[PDB]
Amino acid sequence: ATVQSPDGNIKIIISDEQSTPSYSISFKNKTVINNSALGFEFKQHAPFSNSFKITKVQQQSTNTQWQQPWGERQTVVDQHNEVTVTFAKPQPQGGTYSVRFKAFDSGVGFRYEVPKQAGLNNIEITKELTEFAVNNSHTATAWWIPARGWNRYEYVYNTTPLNDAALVHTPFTFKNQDGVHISIHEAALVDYAAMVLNQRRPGVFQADLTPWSSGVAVKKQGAFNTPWRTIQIGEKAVDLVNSDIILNLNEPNKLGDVSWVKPGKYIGIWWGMHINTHTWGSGDKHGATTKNTKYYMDFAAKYGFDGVLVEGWNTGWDGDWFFNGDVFSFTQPYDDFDIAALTKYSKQTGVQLIGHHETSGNVSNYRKQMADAFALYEKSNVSQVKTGYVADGGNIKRIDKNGIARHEWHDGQFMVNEYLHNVKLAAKHKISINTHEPIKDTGLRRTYPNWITREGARGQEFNAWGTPPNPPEHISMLAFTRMLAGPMDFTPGIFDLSFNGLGANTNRPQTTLAKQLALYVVLYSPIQMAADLPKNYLAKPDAFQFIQDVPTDWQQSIALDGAVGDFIVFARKERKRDKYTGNDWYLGAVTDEQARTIEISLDFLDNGKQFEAHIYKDGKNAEWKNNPYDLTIEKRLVTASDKLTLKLATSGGTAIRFKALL
């Protein structure tokens, strides 16, 4: 069986000639994915592996578009060819299953659909046999983070030959010697275990499902489908970025009217604890006090921020909060945090309190309190909650039905279901969720638009204490790996880079000031933090104006140029909403440890309109180690026929507001 992208450049061949069912993929008539196996093994049920033959293919196609409630673009185009391939094996130990393939111009998705059949009752998958066999893997280069490690998704990216990537998380991005870029991920991860990629024979990446503590991967009753497995393929790195395949593979919005989900910018009592000017726990330096929260709310109201995150408001942080998962209350504030007074103040200022639920990995202590916790927040006019699951890999703690503690993975079926339960319950209270230590993004924000963002990668917080902090290349890695999954709460915008001393050997963002501004356009999220202390923004009002101006919701987004681990340039057009007319464009560019010159055409600007570019760029002598603050701000009249030379300092960047003129 064969299915091709609409333009014909991607071609998938599905076969039954090998030991098992298999597929392969060519791009512009060069094989990029060799024969790759399909099937399952189960704990007790007979395997779905060899001796299955193709009995039927069903071809169809799609050419449609749909609108996002919020996002990186307003209109999403869905154009693909589709084939459902049915496999059958005769008895004894026979069976049948289908695989559905969708071929887009930017990549392919496939999933298994196992129908009701005699003897398929309560089953437990122990292995998914799916492979991604990369052709010419000996000359390919990969950019990856290890899977199953003690620190979950929070690793800096490795740059290695593809054959060195032994056990990796997705999105898993690499390029072959021809320059073709490929990224493997998954979409609509629902009631199933996350896929890790395990390199077997060289270049053969086998699905490695994250298991329950008991050792099985996925529990199902009867007929079941898998999540989609996705293979993005493009001639350029930015072709991976500019694809909507992950969203297109998810089910449409199930929450109805989601106008109560509000993209916007926020600040927080947060960074002070990470740089040790405040504590999460009670005492003389407690961050989460009524007085401090009102001070942040006044600042937010004055400078145009929608909400104030406050961490450490609830009892249980005293001591070493990493070990306090059993004792957190999600309804009882500390005595110095007057939530009723802050509810009144939020209505008086128009600035909302943003809630915070850190579990330190104990999800049963959270689950038992969750209904009361969201009721309190709904009563308190709280519309967004940041959740947290800080614990080492494999050390989620749950209490089973017999009262016995078990350890689970953040990305097993158990936690996949746990996260979605939290999001669905929050939606009943009109609360949106920002998940730290999450399951990776698989596009479910389409289906549940209150799941607005997540962390699931090293963000700004590692620049306070990472030892070492994130390297200069980190953003340009994220843009082509983690960010292919969906939005990230990076918490950009640190203006005081000197709190631990300057130079290359201290814990600090290893960037220039202009790169901190560029992050607001480079890293998409519907909510963007201005992460720093308010007084640090008051010290730099001209630079702060960009953060005040920049939206977080976009009618269109275009990655204009870039290279993995080196640089990226984004242009985005604001969505018409709230104070934004919908006419302004924004640009952000960042580099790695190297200074870089990038030539950019402005032909993305609307034809026939004049713009005033407000350009925030590295000063002539800027360099991140000892001169990160040199900054130039320039105004320049431009149109679509103009061009721009970006001059990025070492770990530098540029941020631009293109203000449409009447």
Annotated binding site: 154, 437, 455, 461, 565-566, 592
Query: If binding is defined by CB under 5 A, does position 158 make contact with Mg ion?
Result: no
Q: Which amino acid is at 600?
A: I
- Given a contact cutoff of 8 angstroms between Cβ atoms, the answer to whether 164 and 212 are in contact is no
Joined together, the tokens standing for residue 593 give: 């440890």
> Which CB sits closer to Mg ion, 461 or 473?
473
> Which CB sits closer to Cl ion, 125 or 147?
147
Query: If binding is defined by CB under 5 A, does position 470 make contact with Cl ion?
Result: yes
Closest CA to 313 of 392, 380, 391, 397: 380
CA distance 17 to 25: 16
Give the footprint of Ca ion on residues 429-488 (CB under 5 A): 436
- DSSP H helices, 289-338, are 290-303
Among 565, 588, 619, 628, binds Mg ion (CB under 5 A): 565
H or E stretch covering 519 = helix 513-522
Say how many CA atoms lie within 13 Å of 17 toward its Cβ. 7
> Which CB sits closer to Mg ion, 79 or 650?
650
> Which CB sits closer to Mg ion, 310 or 522?
522
CA distance 196 to 191: 16
Joined together, the tokens standing for residue 201 give: 């024979």
H or E stretch covering 33 = strand 30-37
Contact of residue 566 among Mg ion, Cl ion, Ca ion, none (CB under 5-8 Å per partner type) = Mg ion
Query: If binding is defined by CB under 5 A, does position 473 make contact with Mg ion?
Result: yes
Give the residue nearest to Ca ion (CB): 436
- Given a contact cutoff of 8 angstroms between Cβ atoms, the answer to whether 218 and 124 are in contact is yes
Total of chain residues touching Cl ion, rule CB under 5 A: 7
* CB 195, min distance to Ca ion, A: 22
> Which CB sits closer to Ca ion, 436 or 572?
436
Joined together, the tokens standing for residue 339 give: 């939530």
Joined together, the tokens standing for residue 35 give: 């024969």
Query: If binding is defined by CB under 5 A, does position 473 make contact with Cl ion?
Result: no
Residues making up the chain, counted from first to last? 662
Annotated binding site for Mg(2+): 565-566, 592
The DSSP secondary structure of 145-196, one letter per residue, reads -BSS-TTTT--PPEEEEGGG--EE-SSEEEE-TTS-EEEEEEE---SSPPEE
Query: If binding is defined by CB under 5 A, does position 220 make contact with Cl ion?
Result: no
* CB 74, min distance to Cl ion, A: 29
Query: If binding is defined by CB under 5 A, does position 454 make contact with Cl ion?
Result: no
Options 131, 418, 461, 574, the catalytic residue:
461
* CB 78, min distance to Mg ion, A: 34
* CB 462, min distance to Ca ion, A: 8
CA distance 51 to 45: 16
Query: If binding is defined by CB under 5 A, does position 437 make contact with Cl ion?
Result: yes
CA distance 352 to 347: 8
Give the footprint of Cl ion on residues 130-189 (CB under 5 A): 152-154
Annotated binding site for Ca(2+): 154, 437, 455, 461
> Which CB sits closer to Cl ion, 312 or 456?
456
273: which strand partners?
none
SS3 262: coil
* CB 564, min distance to Mg ion, A: 8
CA distance 285 to 265: 26
CA distance 467 to 534: 25
Among 219, 474, 508, 515, binds Cl ion (CB under 5 A): 474
Helix axes 363-379, 413-428, angle to 10 degrees: 10
User: Which window, 265-273, 353-361, 374-382, 564-572, contacts Mg ion (CB under 5 A)?
Assistant: 564-572
User: Which window, 26-34, 373-381, 448-456, 478-486, contacts Cl ion (CB under 5 A)?
Assistant: 448-456
Total of chain residues touching Ca ion, rule CB under 5 A: 1
Closest CA to 655 of 625, 628, 631, 626: 631
CB atoms within 10 A of CB 91: 8
Spell out the residues 6+ positions from residue 285 whose beta carbon is closer than 8 angstroms to its own. 277, 278, 279
Site string for Ca ion, 399-438 (x = CB under 5 A): -------------------------------------x--
User: Which window, 163-171, 474-482, 490-498, 521-529, contacts Cl ion (CB under 5 A)?
Assistant: 474-482
461 is catalytic: yes
> Which CB sits closer to Mg ion, 556 or 594?
594
Site string for Mg ion, 574-603 (x = CB under 5 A): ------------------x-----------
Contact of residue 474 among Cl ion, Mg ion, Ca ion, none (CB under 5-8 Å per partner type) = Cl ion
Peptide bond before residue 468 is cis, with ω within 30 degrees of 0: yes
> Which CB sits closer to Ca ion, 436 or 445?
436
CA distance 528 to 489: 7
CA distance 321 to 286: 14
User: Which window, 26-34, 135-143, 392-400, 462-470, contacts Cl ion (CB under 5 A)?
Assistant: 462-470
H or E stretch covering 54 = strand 53-67
Query: If binding is defined by CB under 5 A, does position 564 make contact with Mg ion?
Result: no
Site string for Mg ion, 513-552 (x = CB under 5 A): ----------------------------------------
Query: If binding is defined by CB under 5 A, does position 566 make contact with Mg ion?
Result: yes
Binding residues vs Mg ion (CB under 5 A): 473, 565-566, 592
Residue numbers annotated as active site = 461
Binding residues vs Cl ion (CB under 5 A): 152-154, 437, 456, 470, 474
Binding residues vs Ca ion (CB under 5 A): 436
